[PDB]
Design a binder for this molecule. Sequence first.
Ligand SMILES: [Mg+2]
Ligand SMILES: [Mg+2]
Ligand SMILES: [Mg+2]
Ligand SMILES: [Mg+2]
Ligand SMILES: [Mg+2]
Ligand SMILES: [Mg+2]
Ligand SMILES: [Mg+2]
Ligand SMILES: [Mg+2]
Ligand SMILES: [Mg+2]
Ligand SMILES: [Mg+2]
Ligand SMILES: [Mg+2]
Ligand SMILES: [Mg+2]
Ligand SMILES: [Mg+2]
Ligand SMILES: [Mg+2]
Ligand SMILES: [Mg+2]
Ligand SMILES: [Mg+2]
Ligand SMILES: [Mg+2]
Ligand SMILES: [Mg+2]
Ligand SMILES: [Mg+2]
Ligand SMILES: [Mg+2]
Ligand SMILES: [Mg+2]
Ligand SMILES: [Mg+2]
Ligand SMILES: [Mg+2]
Ligand SMILES: [Mg+2]
Ligand SMILES: [Mg+2]
Ligand SMILES: [Mg+2]
Ligand SMILES: [Mg+2]
Ligand SMILES: [Mg+2]
Ligand SMILES: [Mg+2]
Ligand SMILES: [Mg+2]
Ligand SMILES: [Mg+2]
Ligand SMILES: [Mg+2]
Ligand SMILES: [Mg+2]
Ligand SMILES: [Mg+2]
Ligand SMILES: [Mg+2]
Ligand SMILES: [Mg+2]
Ligand SMILES: [Mg+2]
Ligand SMILES: [Mg+2]
Ligand SMILES: [Mg+2]
Ligand SMILES: [Mg+2]
Lengths: 185, 67, 60, 144, 260
Amino acid sequence: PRAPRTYSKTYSTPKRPYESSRLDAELKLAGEFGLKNKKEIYRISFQLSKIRRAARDLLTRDEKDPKRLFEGNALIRRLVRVGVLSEDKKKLDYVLALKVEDFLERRLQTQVYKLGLAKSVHHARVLITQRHIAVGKQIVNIPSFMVRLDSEKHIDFAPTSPFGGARPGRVARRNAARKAEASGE
Amino acid sequence: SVGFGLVYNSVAEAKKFEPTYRLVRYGLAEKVEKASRQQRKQKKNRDKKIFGTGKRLAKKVARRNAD
Amino acid sequence: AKVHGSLARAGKVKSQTPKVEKTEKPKKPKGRAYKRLLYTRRFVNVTLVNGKRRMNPGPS
Amino acid sequence: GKGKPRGLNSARKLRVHRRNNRWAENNYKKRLLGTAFKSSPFGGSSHAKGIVLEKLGIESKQPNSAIRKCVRVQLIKNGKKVTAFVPNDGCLNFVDENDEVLLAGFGRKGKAKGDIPGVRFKVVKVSGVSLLALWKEKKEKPRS
Amino acid sequence: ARGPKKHLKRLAAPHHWLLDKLSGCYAPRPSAGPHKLRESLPLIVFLRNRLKYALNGREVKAILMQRHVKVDGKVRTDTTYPAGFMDVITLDATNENFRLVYDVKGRFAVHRITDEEASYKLGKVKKVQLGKKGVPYVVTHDGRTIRYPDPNIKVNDTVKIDLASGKITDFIKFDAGKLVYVTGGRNLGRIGTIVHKERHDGGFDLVHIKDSLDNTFVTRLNNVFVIGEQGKPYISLPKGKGIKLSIAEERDRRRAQQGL
RNA sequence: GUAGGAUAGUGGCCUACCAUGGUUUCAACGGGUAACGGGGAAUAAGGGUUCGAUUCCGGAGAGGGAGCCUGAGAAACGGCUACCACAUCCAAGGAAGGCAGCAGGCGCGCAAAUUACCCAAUCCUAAUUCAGGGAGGUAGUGACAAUAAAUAACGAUACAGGGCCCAUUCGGGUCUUGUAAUUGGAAUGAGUACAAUGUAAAUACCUUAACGAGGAACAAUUGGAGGGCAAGUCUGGUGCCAGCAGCCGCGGUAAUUCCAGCUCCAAUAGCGUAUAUUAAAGUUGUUGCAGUUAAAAAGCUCGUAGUUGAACUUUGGGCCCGGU
RNA sequence: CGGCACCUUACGAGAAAUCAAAGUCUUUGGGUUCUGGGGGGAGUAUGGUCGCAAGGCUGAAACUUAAAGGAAUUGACGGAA
Ligand SMILES: [Mg+2]
Ligand SMILES: [Mg+2]
Ligand SMILES: [Mg+2]
Ligand SMILES: [Mg+2]
Ligand SMILES: [Mg+2]
Ligand SMILES: [Mg+2]
Ligand SMILES: [Mg+2]
Ligand SMILES: [Mg+2]
Ligand SMILES: [Mg+2]
Ligand SMILES: [Mg+2]
Ligand SMILES: [Mg+2]
Ligand SMILES: [Mg+2]
Ligand SMILES: [Mg+2]
Ligand SMILES: [Mg+2]
Ligand SMILES: [Mg+2]
Ligand SMILES: [Mg+2]
Ligand SMILES: [Mg+2]
Ligand SMILES: [Mg+2]
Ligand SMILES: [Mg+2]
Ligand SMILES: [Mg+2]
Ligand SMILES: [Mg+2]
Ligand SMILES: [Mg+2]
Ligand SMILES: [Mg+2]
Ligand SMILES: [Mg+2]
Ligand SMILES: [Mg+2]
Ligand SMILES: [Mg+2]
Ligand SMILES: [Mg+2]
Ligand SMILES: [Mg+2]
Ligand SMILES: [Mg+2]
Ligand SMILES: [Mg+2]
Ligand SMILES: [Mg+2]
Ligand SMILES: [Mg+2]
Ligand SMILES: [Mg+2]
Ligand SMILES: [Mg+2]
Ligand SMILES: [Mg+2]
Ligand SMILES: [Mg+2]
Ligand SMILES: [Mg+2]
Ligand SMILES: [Mg+2]
Ligand SMILES: [Mg+2]
Ligand SMILES: [Mg+2]
């Protein structure tokens, strides 16, 4: 008899399960941004649907309505802050025209590869989830971390977990130990 | 690591206001050795069936069960 | 709708099918690397450009 | 005036007219008469366990020509006799006479499916060990 | 059913107590006292949650049983004593006095007053009536019966109670042009002056209140508490003065205060 | 209606005497409910349709009825009395009972977990800081549902053509996606644990010393490949059989559909089936259906309730304040 | 002016045949009543009511089924010309 925990479903399966155009358009995204599933595309499409309807019902208001000027400015500010929307085009007519790859471009898995540092999106995936690249001083192992444009400058390897300067890892320590005992003392 | 901390004005004022479990954690108090919850409640419900001290009941039960 | 037909032929084709064993092959990669493999076979090197794409072409 | 009344005070005529013409639907008629509980052997339920009485072989409907390999199942919760299709190659060898099967419906909310005449249920489990798992090789049927 | 209720569910608590949804199934049901259950603030909610002086309810009990807290000059060792509106809470250790006044969001604020202001409170007259042996008494909003009042004191007036000897030091009439503290509804916590009172014989007299920024709002007379003249309130107002900035002006204040 | 009684109090609540009223096609009364009501939930163009036993509020109940005691508060059932049903112990005289509290068992079924730890939190009760709390919290079982997202990453070496100065005719530091069950060195957590944190005490998480991936066997599955509907006219088997197939359909000797193997597809720690419901369904239609012939204008007229009902009554001008 | 109709056209409507209404309908609202919701089962069973009866009015369900049907085109066929 506590308050029930709120929970939400963050993706949505499309209406037509087998469309060649959509399946090719989703495999291109999953091979370009290094995604695991199509659930990682459905989640972004769900975010787009929520953002786009929250702008679509504010645009039905009068201009200089208080709720439009509050919530539309907050939505624009949040999208500009995460870097999905640029520093120009701060309009509700411009958050309607957003696409799926504008959100996929801002993931930590995309940004780690884009900032040098990973040489592939799949190598960026396996670097992120293996307790390398840290966003501030904080190790992040979530590939959908969705960098907020102020943490772009501080994306770097972790202070622990080598490639960032630490003890040289597991297989290197063991292989160096075998190299040290094979020569002798 | 992020936590919470208390610094009392004296050890006596710490032992007055601090929980007994956390005094047991710090060694300021010995842990009380009781029965478990089930045997405590079972003993209570057994003792609910005796009116009085039970000396007379014990003497009567002993004498009658002797014969 | 006759309900008392012959039942003695049940399991005939599955019983008389010659049992061939599964061959031993390298495992496919799972998850993200399989989508990497699919992206490679469908949108990077397409050796089957027959009109648009053939995905499982039988030997002609 | 396109049939129906339109006036602002004519909501009772529109509401009772929709209530009257609403009965011509299959689902509303079925749901408000409650025919799933009065009839339709599984009393509103999805699955039901029964006991096999006899293995049947149903002639398939024309133009198909096959024996369909069903069972006659007496439901535990009703006592109603139904016919249930044992739905793979083999698998009638897996049931028995006189054991307990779980039946589901057969795809079409009633409405005997395909070329099988009068069979609208199917055997999902026999002896609680799941005909698909028995059919692949996955489980062994218990002897009791 | 069957008797008085003794438990308050969390999520059935008043919303202005700001209790977290998780961490327990129950809320502190206030005791019977001077203030109504949904228009009061228990001492455990004031000490543990607002002042953060205690981490538990066990520590709130440990605070109160040393007779530290006192509400309106009397000690009040109950854990869930209903300290409501206008109540002066003196903590003798820490040497501070609070007055339980609303903030403009509708919540009881941590408002520190002086020891001079802690020597009195204000009380909205609920009824003026004649008691036994023909003795007139007045009843305030916190259940105080005060014998032999001024004959000019009527219902909806505000008396000034001295909290040591609980007498009427002075009083404020209910006229147009006097300050209001709105103590109920969605305009709760707002402060303004009466434009006029709209009568409605039969039920629910209305008051049209205008604040310092000339924003008029209508409030039922159950929720109106006179606190002084035009300007110069008899109590010390909390930080914000009951203005009700809109949410655009609120985020403008936040961006103008956090950027330095 | 009047008067009384009763109640804590209004009142046909009950009584006594009078009056003959009261409800109803604007659906009374009766019947069903696989109906507790609501906040709410699912689906979301809009309107809707369906669900709400279930964490909050209100009601009702403690096996069925009834009656009462104590008390401020009960017609209380972890209170009593009686009857009915069920049922325990007995030395046969008697005596005791009420899990729709927690855990658990049986039965029922398609269908649902531990006879665990503790008041440390939330609060409640009491003479009360101290005691108690199966309320509650904690853990165990738990693919109800939801969140995040391992199962690999990067080269070098054998071969690609996308190419250079008319490579004449392959070179050049060609540019390296694929391709060598080759080849190399890195990366890390699943797991196992010193410890510390965690915690009422432990478990888990979070943090970490030492271990811990090469077939990285530390091996991803569930459904499919005629159309709908993404993906084979490949091979073996069967031969209107076996079986598949929601529907159309496939199978009678080269079966793209069955049973398999290979390959390919779709979702993926999930996927399939059954039942209900929603969208699709403008196939319930107020928005918004159709009635000549597809289902459907009453044989025809009158007519009450119901729905709907012509036009007309201070318009126009002028001046001033006055918010964006 | 009112009536029974008719001829041409298709502004329009319709699945078409065709329609001055079957038009003024996705640019959907003049008022109102009745009826229909895939084909059978079935205008059946049962209940009520009316009738001397025949029957009339009202009127299901279980079950079954992937079409039944409407209009038109080409062919074929006609003991049709
Ligand atoms: Mg590490
Ligand atoms: Mg209760
Ligand atoms: Mg209380
Ligand atoms: Mg009287
Ligand atoms: Mg009376
Ligand atoms: Mg009488
Ligand atoms: Mg019920
Ligand atoms: Mg719609
Ligand atoms: Mg409900
Ligand atoms: Mg409910
Ligand atoms: Mg029920
Ligand atoms: Mg309840
Ligand atoms: Mg009760
Ligand atoms: Mg029972
Ligand atoms: Mg009972
Ligand atoms: Mg008592
Ligand atoms: Mg009772
Ligand atoms: Mg009980
Ligand atoms: Mg009880
Ligand atoms: Mg139980
Ligand atoms: Mg279950
Ligand atoms: Mg005493
Ligand atoms: Mg205790
Ligand atoms: Mg519990
Ligand atoms: Mg999930
Ligand atoms: Mg694995
Ligand atoms: Mg196959
Ligand atoms: Mg296809
Ligand atoms: Mg073949
Ligand atoms: Mg229609
Ligand atoms: Mg017709
Ligand atoms: Mg006619
Ligand atoms: Mg009339
Ligand atoms: Mg008019
Ligand atoms: Mg004429
Ligand atoms: Mg029909
Ligand atoms: Mg008829
Ligand atoms: Mg009859
Ligand atoms: Mg016809
Ligand atoms: Mg025809």
